[PDB]
Enzyme design. Structure first.
Site, mmCIF file in Angstrom:
data_model
loop_
_atom_site.group_PDB
_atom_site.id
_atom_site.type_symbol
_atom_site.label_atom_id
_atom_site.label_comp_id
_atom_site.label_asym_id
_atom_site.label_seq_id
_atom_site.Cartn_x
_atom_site.Cartn_y
_atom_site.Cartn_z
ATOM 1 N N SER A 30 2.078 -5.223 -8.881
ATOM 2 C CA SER A 30 3.095 -6.078 -9.843
ATOM 3 C C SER A 30 2.392 -6.029 -11.012
ATOM 4 O O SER A 30 3.066 -5.925 -12.246
ATOM 5 C CB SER A 30 3.060 -7.559 -9.390
ATOM 6 N N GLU A 34 -7.362 -9.839 -3.590
ATOM 7 C CA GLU A 34 -8.252 -9.438 -4.640
ATOM 8 C C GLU A 34 -7.520 -10.039 -5.848
ATOM 9 O O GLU A 34 -8.200 -9.613 -7.100
ATOM 10 C CB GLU A 34 -8.826 -8.046 -4.913
ATOM 11 N N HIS A 87 0.667 -1.064 -0.017
ATOM 12 C CA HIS A 87 0.078 0.034 0.138
ATOM 13 C C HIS A 87 0.888 1.218 -0.031
ATOM 14 O O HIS A 87 0.372 2.390 -0.535
ATOM 15 C CB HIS A 87 -0.792 0.155 1.220
ATOM 16 N N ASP A 104 -6.249 5.088 3.068
ATOM 17 C CA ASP A 104 -6.477 4.090 1.970
ATOM 18 C C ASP A 104 -7.483 3.394 2.337
ATOM 19 O O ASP A 104 -8.216 3.696 3.149
ATOM 20 C CB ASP A 104 -5.037 3.349 1.832
HETATM 21 O O1 LIG Z 1 10.747 -10.163 -5.272
HETATM 22 C C1 LIG Z 1 9.808 -9.247 -5.094
HETATM 23 C C2 LIG Z 1 8.301 -9.201 -4.756
HETATM 24 C C3 LIG Z 1 7.397 -8.212 -4.943
HETATM 25 N N1 LIG Z 1 8.319 -7.057 -5.070
HETATM 26 C C4 LIG Z 1 7.506 -5.461 -5.193
HETATM 27 O O2 LIG Z 1 6.530 -5.622 -4.228
HETATM 28 C C5 LIG Z 1 5.244 -5.220 -4.615
HETATM 29 C C6 LIG Z 1 4.261 -6.266 -4.956
HETATM 30 O O3 LIG Z 1 2.909 -5.930 -4.517
HETATM 31 P P1 LIG Z 1 1.512 -6.186 -5.187
HETATM 32 O O4 LIG Z 1 0.431 -5.173 -5.216
HETATM 33 O O5 LIG Z 1 2.054 -6.856 -6.429
HETATM 34 O O6 LIG Z 1 0.851 -7.542 -4.238
HETATM 35 P P2 LIG Z 1 1.338 -8.005 -2.988
HETATM 36 O O7 LIG Z 1 2.662 -8.746 -2.782
HETATM 37 O O8 LIG Z 1 1.528 -6.467 -1.923
HETATM 38 O O9 LIG Z 1 0.239 -8.733 -2.070
HETATM 39 C C7 LIG Z 1 5.743 -4.552 -5.990
HETATM 40 O O10 LIG Z 1 5.892 -3.115 -5.775
HETATM 41 C C8 LIG Z 1 6.888 -5.204 -6.436
HETATM 42 O O11 LIG Z 1 7.768 -4.571 -7.231
HETATM 43 C C9 LIG Z 1 9.744 -6.872 -5.196
HETATM 44 O O12 LIG Z 1 10.144 -5.645 -5.449
HETATM 45 N N2 LIG Z 1 10.359 -7.869 -5.313
#
Ligand SMILES: O=c1ccn([C@@H]2O[C@H](COP(=O)(O)OP(=O)(O)O)[C@@H](O)[C@H]2O)c(=O)[nH]1
Length: 461
Positions: free
Chosen positions: A359, A378, A15, A112
């Site tokens: 992502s 989601e 977030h 948020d």
């Molecule tokens: O090995 C990893 C895994 C994730 N991310 C970062 O973590 C976020 C991923 O969050 P997303 O909203 O896709 O889903 P969440 O993992 O938070 O549930 C993005 O900024 C990615 O670039 C990263 O830098 N390296």
């Protein structure tokens, strides 16, 4: 003095990333100043301390004293934890917010999706409350629709025979709705209903999407209705760029558009069984891959992993010899990788993702086609629109028990990198890459929406 905005993210870096970009663009394009108020449930990491102490100059932050969760069951859903992080922080938030209102021209308090309970401090200090929605416009439509939906049907959404029609969205089955609505008896659904009913109190909602990506939902969201806040789609808000893992040096040795990047998210976990099929599936695909691997959620009973049953090293759960056999084609990086830079590298031609919105947006901005493998939150809703509406993702089929076999994985991987099925998604993802650049351009739709919001907030001082 500059118009000042106060921002309260919900716990979780996922977030925080989009909110920092929103702040940066308000600072650079409309000369705002920003304060980031961060609730905590314990000490912050060294990486977090660095990220925070390297924020832009006109952006500062204030850490609230840590909340205690010793009362929560270990099975507590994250949405319950996030919500309680705000309510149990309201006292210290109030004290911090006082000083800001005294020293700055605070024109807005931006929370948020799960921060509506902080509206009460905003109202008490005569500051307009706003909501930053870090996910899809479809998800935002579902939040606004949920009070009605909750009242139109009382059975668990999975048991609905017919697809649920969210205003302006593609039909979606109840089983694919976001996790916190899958158990209507859990505190998580109660918290979600609580917040969604309070979205009417917000003066506005900032959506991390754009029209070329979700024209249906955005169109429905911007149709005026009493009790419905205006919606400003300002996305894609991603950390847009211009290496201790050696990932990028490895990618430099690979041909262009040839590597399948694989990440199941920061919180995504697979059964060890499923992990085996993924590793084996990547080998059978015969494609190049860069796989950020994390430990599985359990261990298979086969003796080959008897000594590593309690291991915390993700590489110990791979099939024996997998690394030796794939050393030339594949790079396996444990736990974390420089994603943004990997998706920007020219050798990356595909992304097997869990469909987290950050992502997804990073992949869209860089035009990398997708294999959708939703896991939690989601992500199942995001997979549907990515696979069936936007049509920029391929999806493997699972067996009756939710197991995706090595062969299906190898099929979708080859389908995306080489097959006829991946031709269309690659093309359509390139058209969206260009669209993302258009909306963020000088006269782009998302740049204009942010300016509309900036004007309204500046007209308060
Ligand atoms: O090995 C990893 C895994 C994730 N991310 C970062 O973590 C976020 C991923 O969050 P997303 O909203 O896709 O889903 P969440 O993992 O938070 O549930 C993005 O900024 C990615 O670039 C990263 O830098 N390296």
């Amino acid at each position: 003095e500059n118009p000042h905005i106060v921002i309260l993210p919900s716990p979780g870096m996922g977030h925080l990333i989009p909110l920092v970009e929103f702040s940066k663009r308000l600072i650079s394009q409309h000369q705002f100043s920003v304060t980031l108020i961060l609730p905590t449930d314990g000490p912050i990491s060294n990486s977090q301390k660095s990220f925070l102490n390297s924020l832009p100059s006109c952006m500062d932050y204030h850490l609230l004293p840590p909340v205690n969760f010793d009362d929560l069951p270990l099975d507590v859903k994250i949405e319950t934890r996030i919500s309680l992080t705000v309510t149990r922080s309201l006292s210290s938030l109030r004290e911090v917010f006082k000083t800001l209102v005294d020293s700055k021209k605070v024109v807005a308090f931006v929370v948020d999706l799960f921060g509506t309970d902080a509206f009460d401090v905003a109202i008490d200090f005569n500051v307009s409350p706003y909501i930053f929605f870090p996910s899809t416009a479809m998800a935002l439509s579902l939040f606004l629709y949920l009070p009605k939906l909750d009242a139109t049907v009382s059975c668990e959404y999975r048991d609905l025979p017919d697809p649920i029609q969210i205003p302006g969205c593609i039909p979606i089955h109840g089983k694919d709705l976001l996790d916190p609505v899958q158990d209507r008896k859990n505190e998580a659904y109660r918290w979600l209903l609580h917040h969604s009913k309070r979205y009417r109190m917000a003066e506005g909602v900032v959506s991390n999407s754009f029209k070329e990506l979700e024209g249906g939902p955005i169109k429905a969201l911007q149709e005026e209705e009493p009790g419905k806040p205006p919606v400003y789609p300002v996305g894609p808000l991603i950390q847009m760029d211009s290496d201790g893992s050696g990932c990028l040096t490895w990618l430099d040795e690979q041909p262009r558009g040839s590597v399948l990047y694989v990440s199941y998210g920061s919180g995504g976990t697979l059964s060890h069984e499923q992990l085996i099929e993924v590793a084996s599936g990547l080998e059978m695909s015969e494609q190049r891959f860069l796989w950020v691997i994390r430990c599985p959620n359990d261990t298979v009973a086969n003796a080959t992993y008897f000594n590593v049953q309690d291991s915390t090293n993700p590489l110990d759960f791979l099939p024996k010899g997998f690394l030796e056999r794939t050393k030339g084609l594949g790079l396996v990086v444990p736990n974390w990788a420089p994603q943004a830079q990997i998706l920007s590298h020219g050798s990356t031609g595909g992304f097997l993702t869990h469909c987290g919105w950050n992502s997804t947006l990073e992949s869209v901005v860089h035009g990398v086609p997708l294999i959708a493998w939703p896991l939690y939150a989601e992500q199942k809703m995001n997979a549907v629109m990515l696979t069936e509406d936007i049509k920029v993702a391929l999806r493997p089929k699972a067996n009756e028990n939710g197991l995706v076999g090595r062969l299906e994985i190898a099929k979708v991987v080859k389908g995306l990198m080489e097959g006829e099925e991946g031709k269309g998604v690659r093309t359509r993802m390139r058209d969206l890459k260009d669209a993302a650049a258009k909306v963020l351009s000088q006269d782009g739709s998302s740049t204009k929406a942010l300016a509309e919001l900036a004007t309204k907030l500046k007209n308060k001082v």
